[PDB]
């Protein structure tokens, strides 16, 4: 399907009766390559390892907003301890993750994820889903989140750039 | 053009969008994480630990010097009729 199409908006994976379409945003090698990578995606890899990447990244990100816009912006006493706040959020966010994991049982008919790639290769399964898999992932997130939080505080609780 | 009762999957959006990636892995540093992230992987056990982790909130408020809990002092208004 390249490249004298001279048009953009190919029907989704050749199927024009499934709702969605193909656009550069939907499917561009740059986007696709980008989307294929990352912890949420990257099937066939340990869930716990993925949660850590995702968890670690988010925890680190959360500190900035809480510290800067916190009720003590604005205070030595609350110089960044508010990061504790960022941490609390990941404690709560790990609950929400844990309870959601109870929508997947241990029987478990593992994986509600599709069983095939596009190109209809027809091969493989995902495994993020399922009770055991999801739980590992949360635990990674919790671990990743608390850490990302502490590290970001670390640098700030020293800093020098930018004051 | 391409409907096959044989495979109900490709017929539907059963297919994983190419965003799936079933490729290799990531560095061996994992061997470390798998060791120390294990207690949080159990589920239910973690549900509890976090809720009882709410014991932190109690501790943090029972002891807190700089939250407005003092007047600081004033002479109160009477005030419309005392």
């Amino acid at each position: 399907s390249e490249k004298p199409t001279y048009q953009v908006v190919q029907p989704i994976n050749g199927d024009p009766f499934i709702g969605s379409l193909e656009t550069p945003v939907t499917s561009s090698p740059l986007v696709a390559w980008y989307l294929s990578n990352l912890p949420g995606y990257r099937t066939a890899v340990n869930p716990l390892l993925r949660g850590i990447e995702v968890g670690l990244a988010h925890g680190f990100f959360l500190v900035g907003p809480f510290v800067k816009a916190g009720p003590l912006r604005n205070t030595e006493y609350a110089g960044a301890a508010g990061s504790l706040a960022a941490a609390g959020l990941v404690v709560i966010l790990s609950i929400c993750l844990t309870i959601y994991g109870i929508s997947s049982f241990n029987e478990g008919d593992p994986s509600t994820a599709p069983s095939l790639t596009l190109t209809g290769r027809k091969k493989q399964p995902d495994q993020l889903q399922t009770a055991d898999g999801w739980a590992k992932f949360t635990g990674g997130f919790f671990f990743g989140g608390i850490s990302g939080v502490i590290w970001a505080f670390f640098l700030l609780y020293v800093l020098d750039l930018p004051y | 053009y391409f409907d096959l009762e044989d495979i109900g999957n490709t017929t539907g959006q059963w297919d994983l969008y190419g965003s799936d990636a079933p490729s290799p892995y990531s560095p061996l540093q994992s061997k470390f994480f798998e060791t120390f992230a294990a207690p949080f992987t159990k589920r239910g056990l973690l549900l509890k630990f976090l809720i009882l982790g709410g014991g932190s909130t109690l501790a943090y408020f029972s002891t807190t010097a700089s939250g407005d809990i003092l007047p600081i002092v004033k002479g109160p208004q009477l005030p419309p009729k005392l």
Binding site: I92, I95, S103 | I51, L58, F61, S62
Partner: peptide
């Protein structure tokens, strides 16, 4: 004293909302 209880009055919604969620999706 009274600075210990209104938070458990907020730990309780966390606990209640979580339990009820499990109850309603079952």
């Amino acid at each position: 004293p009274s600075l210990f209880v209104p938070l458990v009055g907020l730990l309780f919604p966390a606990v209640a909302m979580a339990s009820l969620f499990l109850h309603v999706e079952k």
